[PDB]
Ligand binder design. Structure first.
Ligand SMILES: [Mg+2]
Ligand SMILES: [Mg+2]
Ligand SMILES: [Mg+2]
Ligand SMILES: [Mg+2]
Ligand SMILES: [Mg+2]
Ligand SMILES: [Mg+2]
Ligand SMILES: [Mg+2]
Ligand SMILES: [Mg+2]
Ligand SMILES: [Mg+2]
Ligand SMILES: [Mg+2]
Ligand SMILES: [Mg+2]
Ligand SMILES: [Mg+2]
Ligand SMILES: [Mg+2]
Ligand SMILES: [Mg+2]
Ligand SMILES: [Mg+2]
Ligand SMILES: [Mg+2]
Ligand SMILES: [Mg+2]
Ligand SMILES: [Mg+2]
Ligand SMILES: [Mg+2]
Ligand SMILES: [Mg+2]
Ligand SMILES: [Mg+2]
Ligand SMILES: [Mg+2]
Lengths: 131, 74, 134, 156, 199
RNA sequence: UGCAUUAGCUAGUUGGUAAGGUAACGGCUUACCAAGGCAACGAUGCAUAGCCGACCUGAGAGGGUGAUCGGCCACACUGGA
RNA sequence: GUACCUAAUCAGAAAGCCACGGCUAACUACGUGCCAGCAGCCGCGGUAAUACGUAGGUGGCAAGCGUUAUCCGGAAUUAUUGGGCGUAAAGCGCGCGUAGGCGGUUUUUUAAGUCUGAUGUGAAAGCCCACGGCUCAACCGUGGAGGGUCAUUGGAAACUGGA
RNA sequence: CGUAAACGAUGAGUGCUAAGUGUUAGGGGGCCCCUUAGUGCUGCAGCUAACGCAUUAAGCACUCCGCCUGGGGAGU
C-alpha cells in the first residue's frame, strides 16, 4: 500500500513535469501543503490552491516553464525515507547543485530550505532535494 | 551526592528494557532488548507491569537493580 | 537489496587467494603442525631435475622437483641458459609461475645456495646471479 | 580557430566472399578552448581521410559549456548508454584530473581545472558522448535565476 | 654535482638549453645517440608530462627524490601548487648563488656552496638545497673573496632578477622578496608537472 | 572476530533464608527451601585473537596491521598451593 | 680528544642497477633458427627477431637498483556513500501465515529518536597548521587544531516514535 | 514422492505518466457517448547493451521479501 505520501507527491510532480502538464492535483496533507508553498516561494512552481473536501483536502499545483518551454524544475529526489531516515545538523547542511538547487528540511521551526536552516542554525530531517 | 542509572521496562518474569542500536554502517535504528534481573522486595510486581528500576550494589549472582516504582499495572 | 535486508545480512567481500601457497606456510617440527608465515623465499632440496614440454610453445623447459623446508613438494622453474643442478641440490625457491608450464608455480633463485649464476651473462646479471666481470 | 585531437583510431572489418575489407574509424574532438567543444566521427580506408571526415562532422554539433572562472558551475554526472562520467568543480590550482577521452573533451572546452571520474564503460565513443551529455546539462546561476524569477543574490 | 654527465646531451634530448644560453642546441637540435638525426614520432600524454618534469629537474640539477620532496613541500602552502613549486626551486642557495652572478654556470654555483665558499646571513652554509628566505644575505667567505672563478663571473654583469639585489663591490647579495612566475623560466609548463604527479 | 554444514545450554545452575567467609558486595562457600536462569537480538560448542592510543592505505566512506613508543591486561619450564 | 674549527697536499681513493614491441620513458647491429631461451598481460622464437643472447646507443633511477612475499588502491569487482536480477549470474513452482520491517488524514500531548547551547571528559607521544633549535633536511621541541555512536544538564517541537 | 523451459525465463503491494484499436463481464446516459474490472494488438514520453518494454512497463517513485557477484570443478 502507500508508504511515502511525500515521495508520491514528489513523483507526481516529476511525472507531470516530464510531459509538461500545466497543473496536477493530489490529495492534501499539512507537510505537502508546506512543501508546495516553499516551491512557490523559491520560484520552482507557479501557484498552489487548496480545495477543501470531505476526505482530506486536495492540492492543485501549477507548473512553471520558461522560454522555449524549458522546465524550471530539473529534478526532485526523496532523501529521508521510511526505510532509512536522514537527519542533518546545521553545520553539515547539504548544498544542492552547488547552491543552484534547494533542500527541503523539516526542523523544529517548521519546514524550511537549507539556506535558511543554516541562517537559523537549526538542523532536522532532510525531506528532499529540488534542483 | 551522585546519580544511579534509572531504567523503565516491562516485567518478563515474576525486566525487559528494549532500546535501539543504530547500525554502524547503514544508519538504520534496530530495536534490541536486555533483561535486567531486579530486586522486588515483597514480590509486589507481576508479569507485564511497566516498572522503574535503579542501579544498586550487587545483590546476588546476577541482580544489580532494585524495583523502585510501578508505572503501568499488568 | 533493501536497507533492512542489508541490516539482516550484511555485504561480504570475496576472499582473495594466494598465487604461491607453498611460500606462505611453515612447519614446526616439534609439534608436527603447519604454520602460516608469508615467507618471500623458501629453502628446499632437489628431488628430481629434468625437462618438460610447454603447452603453441615448443621447447624443453628445465625444472626441478623440490621438497621445501615446510615438507611441501613443488615444481620450480630453472631460469637462464645452463644450470649446475641435480638430485640432492639445495636450492632457494621464490614465487612466480611460468606460463605455458602447467604445474610449475615457482622459480629457483640463481646464485643462491647451491645454484650457480648463469655462465657468460652480461645484461641483467642480478636476475641470474652472475657477478660483475673484470 | 578550433583545435582538434584524435581520440581513437580503430581499424574495422566487414567480411565478403573473398577475405576481409578494412576501413579506419577516427573519433575526433574539436574545441576552441573558449567554451565550445564538439565531437565527430569519420570512416575511410585511409587514416588521414577518416580524420578529416571526423573533424568536419565534429564542427556541426558544437556545445556551449557554462564556466565560472575556469571551472564548472556545479557537480554533474553525464551518462550515455553504458558510459557515465562524474565531473566536479575544482580549485584553480588543480589541473584537469581526467583519465582518457574525457581529458580531450574537457581541455578543448577550456576547463583546466576539474575533478572527473569515469564510472562506466571505457569505450571511447560512449565515454565522449557521456562527457558531452554532462556538459550539456550544466546550468549557470544567471540562467536558473531567470527561470525562478529571482535575482542571483536571492538564489543564495 | 650529483649528475655529472653531458649537459649538452641532456639539453638536446629535452629540447631546452640547460646553460640558459642556447649553445647546446646550436648545431644539432635533436636527441643524442644513434637515432638522433632520424626523426621519431609524436610524444604520448605520459611522455609529455614526463619531459616537462625532466626539463625542470635537470635545470636545477637535482635528483628525483629531492625534486619530488620539494614538490610536496610546495604543495602545502596557500596558492597555486605548480607556481609555488617554481618559486621554491628558485630560492635554493644553489640557484640564488648563480642568479646573483657569483658563478658562470649552475654547476659552478653548486661547487662553491658545497665546498664552503658561501655564507648566508654571515654564517657558512654548505648545503646546496638550502632554501633562502626573503631578507637573507648571501656573501663570500673572506678567504675566497679573491678567487678567479668568483671574480670573472662578477664582471659579466648579467640581468640579476628583480627579486634579488646584488652589490658587486661588496660581493654580497640580498633576497629581496619571493619571485613571481614571470621572473622564473617560461619554457616550463608547470601545469604538466602537477598532472605528472597526479598519476 | 569467524562458523548455524555448531540449537539447544546450565543443576551452585537461578532466586530465597541462615551461617561462614572477604578489604569489600555477592552462590564467594555450605546447609535447607523453591524451580528457576540463558538462547534465533545467536545461547552453547569449535576455531582464531592479548586490547587500545596509534600505524599503512584510501578523495572519502571504508579496508588492513598491532614490530617500535605510551596506557591497560596476562604470563615467568608445566600444574597445584 | 667525539662534534666542531683552523692549516697544508691531491682530481687524485669514491657508480652501479634495471629497462628500451604495446601498456610504458627509451632502437639498431650481429648470433640463434618453435632451438636455445623470454614472459605481469597481449604474447615473442619454426633463416632479414626493436620481445631470445651479446654489442653499441638510449631511457629511468642512483649509493642504490631490481626480484619475490604481503596489505590498501586502481576494483562502482559486496555498490550506506556507490551495482544488479525479461534474454548476460540473479524472482523461491505457487498459496496461507508467525516474528520482524514498513505503514492514510487531522487536533492535543509527550520528549525516546532529531535539532540546539552549557559543563566534564576523550592522557602523553603521533597526524595536520604555526613557530623555535639542529649549517639545511631528516629529526627534535613548543603552542594550537582534530578525533565520541561519550556522559550529565538547559532549551525547540516540524518529522519518526509513545499517549 | 515434491520435481519441470513449474516460463511472461518478468516477486508482492501502492500511486503517477500520450494516444489508437479488438475482445470478455458489468454499469450510466442519449446503435452511439461515458465509465468499472479483465484480456489482446499497435504505439509516444521514458527506459534499454541491443532486442525490445511501454496504464497488463522492462517508465517514474516508496515499502517488504527472495536471489546474484567470472567459467569449469559442481548442484558434485
Ligand atoms: Mg595467541
Ligand atoms: Mg575508492
Ligand atoms: Mg615510447
Ligand atoms: Mg631478460
Ligand atoms: Mg637476425
Ligand atoms: Mg618486450
Ligand atoms: Mg634482447
Ligand atoms: Mg640519498
Ligand atoms: Mg589489491
Ligand atoms: Mg583492489
Ligand atoms: Mg555489475
Ligand atoms: Mg526486481
Ligand atoms: Mg542461457
Ligand atoms: Mg540467466
Ligand atoms: Mg514466478
Ligand atoms: Mg523449479
Ligand atoms: Mg633537523
Ligand atoms: Mg528461475
Ligand atoms: Mg512491481
Ligand atoms: Mg505500477
Ligand atoms: Mg509497444
Ligand atoms: Mg485494458
Amino acid at each position: 500500500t502507500m508508504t511515502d505520501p511525500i515521495a508520491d507527491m514528489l513523483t507526481r510532480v516529476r511525472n507531470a513535469n516530464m510531459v509538461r502538464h500545466e497543473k496536477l492535483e493530489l490529495p492534501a496533507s499539512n507537510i505537502k501543503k508546506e512543501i508546495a508553498e516553499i516551491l512557490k516561494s523559491e520560484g520552482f512552481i507557479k501557484n498552489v490552491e487548496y480545495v477543501e473536501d470531505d476526505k482530506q483536502g486536495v492540492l492543485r499545483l501549477f507548473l512553471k516553464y520558461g522560454q522555449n518551454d524549458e522546465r524550471v524544475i530539473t529534478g526532485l529526489k526523496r532523501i529521508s525515507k521510511p526505510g532509512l531516515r536522514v537527519y542533518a545538523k546545521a553545520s553539515e547542511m547539504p548544498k544542492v547543485l552547488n547552491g543552484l538547487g534547494i533542500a527541503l528540511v523539516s526542523t523544529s521551526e517548521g519546514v524550511i530550505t537549507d539556506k535558511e536552516a543554516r541562517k537559523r542554525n537549526v538542523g532536522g530531517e532532510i525531506i528532499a532535494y529540488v534542483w | 551526592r551522585n546519580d544511579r542509572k534509572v531504567y523503565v521496562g516491562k516485567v518478563v518474569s515474576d525486566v525487559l528494557v528494549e532500546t535501539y542500536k543504530t547500525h554502524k554502517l547503514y544508519g538504520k535504528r534496530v530495536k534490541y532488548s536486555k533483561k535486567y534481573k531486579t530486586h522486588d522486595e515483597n514480590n509486589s510486581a507481576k508479569l507485564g507491569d511497566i516498572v522503574k528500576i535503579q542501579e544498586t550494589r550487587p545483590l546476588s549472582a546476577t541482580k544489580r537493580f532494585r524495583l523502585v516504582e510501578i508505572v503501568e499495572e499488568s | 537489496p533493501t536497507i533492512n535486508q542489508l541490516v539482516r545480512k550484511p555485504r561480504q567481500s570475496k576472499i582473495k587467494k594466494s598465487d604461491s601457497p607453498a611460500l606462505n606456510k611453515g612447519f614446526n617440527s616439534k609439534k608436527k603442525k603447519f604454520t602460516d608465515l608469508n615467507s618471500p623465499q623458501k629453502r628446499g632440496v632437489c628431488t628430481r631435475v629434468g625437462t618438460m614440454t610447454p603447452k603453441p610453445n615448443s621447447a624443453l623447459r628445465k625444472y626441478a622437483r623440490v621438497r621445501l623446508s615446510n615438507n611441501i613438494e613443488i615444481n620450480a622453474y630453472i631460469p637462464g641458459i645452463g644450470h649446475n643442478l641435480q638430485e640432492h641440490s639445495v636450492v632457494l625457491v621464490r614465487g612466480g609461475r611460468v606460463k605455458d608450464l602447467p604445474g610449475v608455480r615457482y622459480h629457483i633463485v640463481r646464485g643462491a645456495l647451491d645454484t650457480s649464476g648463469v655462465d657468460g651473462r652480461r645484461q641483467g646479471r642480478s636476475l641470474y646471479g652472475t657477478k660483475k666481470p673484470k | 580557430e578550433f583545435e582538434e585531437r584524435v581520440v581513437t583510431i580503430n581499424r574495422v572489418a566487414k567480411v565478403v566472399k573473398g577475405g576481409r575489407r578494412f576501413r579506419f574509424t577516427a573519433l575526433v574532438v574539436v574545441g576552441d578552448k573558449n567554451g565550445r567543444v564538439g565531437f565527430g566521427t569519420g570512416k575511410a580506408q585511409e587514416v588521414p581521410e577518416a580524420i578529416k571526415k571526423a573533424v568536419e562532422a565534429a564542427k556541426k554539433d558544437l556545445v556551449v559549456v557554462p564556466r565560472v572562472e575556469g571551472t564548472t558551475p556545479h557537480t554533474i554526472t553525464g551518462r550515455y548508454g553504458s558510459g557515465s562520467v562524474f565531473m566536479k568543480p575544482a580549485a584553480p590550482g588543480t589541473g584537469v584530473i581526467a583519465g582518457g577521452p574525457v581529458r580531450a573533451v574537457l581541455e578543448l572546452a577550456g576547463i583546466t581545472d576539474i575533478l572527473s571520474k569515469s564510472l562506466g564503460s571505457n569505450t571511447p565513443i560512449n565515454m565522449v558522448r557521456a562527457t558531452i551529455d554532462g556538459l550539456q546539462n550544466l546550468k549557470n546561476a544567471e540562467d536558473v535565476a531567470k527561470l525562478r524569477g529571482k535575482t542571483v543574490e536571492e538564489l543564495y | 654535482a650529483r649528475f655529472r654527465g653531458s649537459n649538452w646531451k641532456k639539453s638536446r634530448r629535452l629540447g631546452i638549453s640547460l646553460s640558459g644560453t642556447g649553445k647546446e642546441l646550436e648545431k644539432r637540435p635533436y636527441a643524442p645517440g644513434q637515432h638522433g638525426p632520424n626523426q621519431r614520432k609524436k610524444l604520448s600524454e605520459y611522455g609529455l608530462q614526463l619531459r616537462e618534469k625532466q626539463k625542470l629537474r635537470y635545470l636545477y640539477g637535482m635528483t628525483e627524490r629531492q625534486f619530488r620532496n620539494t614538490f610536496d613541500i610546495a604543495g602545502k602552502k596557500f596558492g597555486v601548487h605548480g607556481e609555488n613549486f617554481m618559486i621554491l626551486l628558485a630560492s635554493r642557495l644553489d640557484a640564488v648563488v648563480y642568479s646573483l652572478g657569483l658563478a658562470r654556470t649552475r654547476r659552478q654555483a653548486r661547487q662553491l656552496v658545497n665546498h664552503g665558499h658561501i655564507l648566508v646571513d654571515g654564517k657558512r652554509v654548505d648545503i646546496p638545497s638550502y632554501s633562502v628566505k626573503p631578507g637573507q644575505t648571501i656573501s663570500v667567505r673572506e678567504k675566497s673573496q679573491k678567487l678567479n672563478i668568483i671574480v670573472e663571473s662578477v664582471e659579466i654583469n648579467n640581468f640579476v632578477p628583480e627579486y634579488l639585489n646584488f652589490d658587486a663591490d661588496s660581493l654580497t647579495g640580498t633576497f629581496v622578496r619571493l619571485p613571481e612566475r614571470s621572473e622564473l623560466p617560461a619554457e616550463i609548463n608547470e601545469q604538466l608537472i602537477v598532472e605528472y604527479y597526479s598519476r
